[PDB]
Nucleic acid binder design. Structure first.
Lengths: 178, 148, 40, 32, 315, 55, 59
RNA sequence: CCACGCGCCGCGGCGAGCCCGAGGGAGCCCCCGCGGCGGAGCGAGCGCGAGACGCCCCGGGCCCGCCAUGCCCCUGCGGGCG
């Protein structure tokens, strides 16, 4: 008969092991979990969690943003959590070393021509377990269009968008319409 | 699949997860989106503003092809050129043999400006040019020529 | 690396055990003081 | 998402199921 | 890459074929399952009940107050038009309007065909898939046969190259099947065994009859065949021409680049065995002793653990 | 049929289950409703010199 | 004390003599270290977590 | 239960892309295979059309349209700059 309810606020659900059936991805979290357990280095801790995220949560960090992100220090390796796909908007891309779970075929070519090395995550574990000279970056998770139409369009304090064509004057023209 | 579903687990649980006080009865409150301005006004308004009401001028039969206006941002104009020519056109610079991109044949009609063209002379050939676009293009050195 | 037990563990346990003895006696002297300190 | 944010459905109601001039078609005859 | 070894009908010919690259593609069991279950379901014949089944009879409900349960009834009063009634329509009738086929996008289907072939090259995977490969000398077994039209001359190649055990057990089973299957036109289950791939070298006439052997062209390698029962790991025998043309067939897809090789579990474990990351590991705090609680007053020792000076008080 | 009307009994428990949630910092100092002149002064001043969000 | 008066009906309270303080902390004393309820059977446990507040031993 | 419309969510492939469409192929599970969907919005329309930051997230600041308006001016109730 313990009233423990007042002290707590209920358990919180969080991924522990990536649910992806891809064997290669489970193997890497297991490795970053062995490394994290032995040494509590935070880079290793975020790495473990970023692999664990959902395929929607992990976003595309295209090379052009990557270059802008690393323009001051291209020497630093950048461990992007998800798929890097090159954007041809930036005609010339600088030398960069990026460790990513996946690289697009076009992307590989652009950083290879740029003299940069797209090293795989397994290579990262071999060289830098600690994340020395490594910055862990991720794309805008809010990039998704589904994130934009999330909410309660209608109520004035939303500033989001109704889903559909609508074609309706009622409610559309100002807070005084409707 | 048939074996893995919420429904199979609920067998053996009476009304099957639809409640006892009010069960799953046929079409409980309406068939269709009924109650637009009466019983279901609060749901329609809280989420779908603008369900009811005429607004725009009516074109009885629109000509879809005429309405089509693909528009290419003045950043992606350059990446239309492939890399066996992309490196050369940029490194050479030079007005005499300057690259000429015909966006008409690449599949767009009007150019817009949303970035920075790399600084190389270029003759764009398209159906129309956007004010922002031409202002940046002329400054980079490029000229916007209208295509037939 | 596994000398952690030799390093300040038997020694720290000894430090605490010995100083507990000295603390154990003075503390008792204060408790005895209350029976007469308030009484006088 | 029963209600809350849902789109308005663009589905015309199924027509002539029980009787009707065989509205439905199936593409099982395409391998042959 | 090490050239594979071509074995002649009796003994290896002096032929070495460079490993086609399809073999190094990662073995993903997950994708090779998803593509298979969908691909086999794709090939199904629709089953349903009659649309006019049960509704043919005529019943107007007897209705309440006549003491009959309320159900549509015939002239006498017999149960009709209900799932609980005998002869009634199954309330939810089965349907011929079902998604019999589950489509897969072309990249994914090609992915799996490669993944199975590369698992097949692993010898261990085939043994697990229940094939007696201990006899076969080198997998992938490229056996060079110019042409075989006689079953006996085909048996000859298979027996000499250590496939005899696999073929024998395929005939040995052939048991009658279990359950309603016998009456449904599938009376005998012959355990599946090796698969022979040919490129213009006719092996069709000689190898077709033998049980457990299936013959495919290199151009088309059907997943259902590459993995029997949605499990990757077939015993594969290759005519020389077919194995040579593997990397040639794999360049016919206009844009299919092979999927990038991943790393095996042992190699990632070797990376953690490597002193690089062993150096990064540092010992943490020693675990806190927990123990159980005993009354200090009862035992001199526990009183000593709690207070050394206090224990010596009795003298 | 005669029925119940309105009673707040139990409404308090429902609300205080995990309630009393602070309104959030983004609306603690939001620019909605502020003097129109104050807003133009703040934006024009910030742009010049140190907060040159400009180019 | 003001809080106690608000909820007095449930509780019970008094000044604790040194021997009550001793027997409770020696016979039923438990520790909240690391969020567990490790029993305090020996002097070392108090020192590991309470040395930084000068509580070297259970005495 | 099955179908198809929808809204999320978890995977798998790929990435400014992606797409076993109908079909065609001596092929059947294999090869080739468009419209489509995105990539740019806003405005009733004439139409006009986003750069400036930022690990992410939140704001802030800006830019695009629809509005008003002040100036300047070209090819001009047209363009520019606020």
């Amino acid at each position: 008969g313990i009233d423990l309810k007042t002290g707590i606020k209920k358990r919180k659900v969080e991924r522990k092991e990536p649910k992806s059936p891809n064997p290669y991805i489970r193997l890497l979290h297991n490795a970053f979990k062995v490394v994290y357990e032995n040494t509590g280095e935070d880079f290793t801790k975020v790495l473990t969690k970023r692999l664990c995220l959902s395929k929607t949560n992990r976003p595309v960090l295209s090379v052009s943003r990557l270059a802008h992100l690393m323009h001051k220090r291209e020497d630093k390796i950048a461990v992007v959590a998800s798929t890097v796909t090159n954007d041809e908007r930036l005609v010339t891309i600088p030398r960069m070393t990026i460790c990513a779970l996946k690289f697009s075929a076009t992307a590989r070519s652009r950083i290879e021509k740029a003299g940069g090395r797209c090293m795989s995550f397994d290579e990262l574990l071999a060289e830098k377990p600690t994340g020395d000279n490594c910055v862990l970056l991720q794309g805008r998770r809010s990039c998704r269009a589904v994130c934009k139409k999330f909410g309660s369009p209608g109520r004035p304090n939303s500033h989001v968008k109704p889903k559909g064509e609508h074609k309706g004057r009622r409610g559309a023209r100002g807070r005084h319409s409707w | 699949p048939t074996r893995i579903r919420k429904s199979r687990k609920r067998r053996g649980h009476r009304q099957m997860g639809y409640g006892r006080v009010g069960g799953h009865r046929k079409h409980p409150s309406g068939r269709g989106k009924a109650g637009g301005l009466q019983h279901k006004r609060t749901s329609f308004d809280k989420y779908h503003p603008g369900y009811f009401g005429k607004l725009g001028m009516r074109n009885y039969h629109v000509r879809r092809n005429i309405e089509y206006n693909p528009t290419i941002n003045i950043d992606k104009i350059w990446s239309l050129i492939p890399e066996e020519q992309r490196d050369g056109f940029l490194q050479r610079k030079s007005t005499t043999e300057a690259p000429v991109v015909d966006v008409t044949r690449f599949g767009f009609f009007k150019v817009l400006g949303r970035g920075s063209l790399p600084q190389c002379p270029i003759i764009i050939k398209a159906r129309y040019f956007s004010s922002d676009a031409e202002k940046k293009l002329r400054e980079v050195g490029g000229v916007p020529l209208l295509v037939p | 690396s596994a000398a952690e037990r030799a390093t300040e563990k038997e020694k720290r346990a000894a430090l605490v055990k010995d100083h507990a003895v000295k603390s154990a006696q003075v503390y008792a002297r204060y408790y005895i003081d209350l029976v007469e300190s308030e009484k006088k | 998402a029963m209600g809350r944010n849902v789109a308005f459905s663009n589905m015309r109601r199924y027509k002539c199921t029980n009787k009707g001039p065989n509205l439905i078609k199936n593409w099982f005859n395409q391998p042959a | 890459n090490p050239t594979v070894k071509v074995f002649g009908p009796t003994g290896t010919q002096v032929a070495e074929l460079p490993r086609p690259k399809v073999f190094n593609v990662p073995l993903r069991p997950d994708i090779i399952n998803f593509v298979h279950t969908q691909l086999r379901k794709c090939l199904r014949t629709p089953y349903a009940v009659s649309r006019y089944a049960g509704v043919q009879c005529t019943a107007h409900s007897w209705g309440p107050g006549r003491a009959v349960a309320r159900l549509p009834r015939k002239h006498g009063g017999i149960g009709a038009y209900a799932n609980f009634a005998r002869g009634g329509h199954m309330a939810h009738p089965t349907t011929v309007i079902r998604r019999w086929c589950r489509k897969v996008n072309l990249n994914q289907r090609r992915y799996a065909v490669a993944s199975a072939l590369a698992a097949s090259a692993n010898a261990a995977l085939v043994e697990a898939r229940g094939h007696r490969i201990a006899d076969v000398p080198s997998i992938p077994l490229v056996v060079d046969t110019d042409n075989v039209t006689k079953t006996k001359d085909a048996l000859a190649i298979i027996k000499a190259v250590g496939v005899l055990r696999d073929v024998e057990r395929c005939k040995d089973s052939r048991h009658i099947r279990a359950g309603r299957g016998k009456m449904r036109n599938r009376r005998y289950i012959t355990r599946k065994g090796p698969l022979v791939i040919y490129n213009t070298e006719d092996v069709a006439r000689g190898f077709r009859n033998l049980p457990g052997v299936d013959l495919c062209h290199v151009s088309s390698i059907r997943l259902l065949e590459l993995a029997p029962g949605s499990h990757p790991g077939r015993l594969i025998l290759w005519t020389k021409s077919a194995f040579a043309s593997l990397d040639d067939v794999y360049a016919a897809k206009q844009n299919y680049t092979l999927p990038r090789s991943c790393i095996t579990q042992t190699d990632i474990e070797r990376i953690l065995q490597s002193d690089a990351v062993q150096k990064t590991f540092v010992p943490k705090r020693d675990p806190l002793v927990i123990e159980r609680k005993v009354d200090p007053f009862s035992s001199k020792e526990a009183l000593a653990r709690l207070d050394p000076s206090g224990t010596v008080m009795p003298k | 049929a005669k029925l119940k009307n309105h009673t707040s009994k139990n409404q308090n428990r429902k609300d205080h289950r995990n309630g009393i949630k602070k309104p959030k910092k983004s609306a603690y100092t939001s620019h909605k409703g502020m003097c129109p002149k104050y807003l133009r002064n703040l934006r024009r001043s910030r742009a010049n010199d140190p907060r040159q969000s400009l180019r | 004390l003001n809080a106690l008066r608000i909820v007095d009906h449930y509780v019970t309270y008094g000044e604790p003599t040194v021997e009550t303080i001793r027997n409770l902390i020696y016979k039923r004393g438990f520790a909240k270290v690391n969020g567990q309820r490790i029993p305090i059977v020996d002097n070392n446990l108090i020192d590991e977590q309470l040395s930084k507040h000068n509580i070297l031993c259970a005495e």
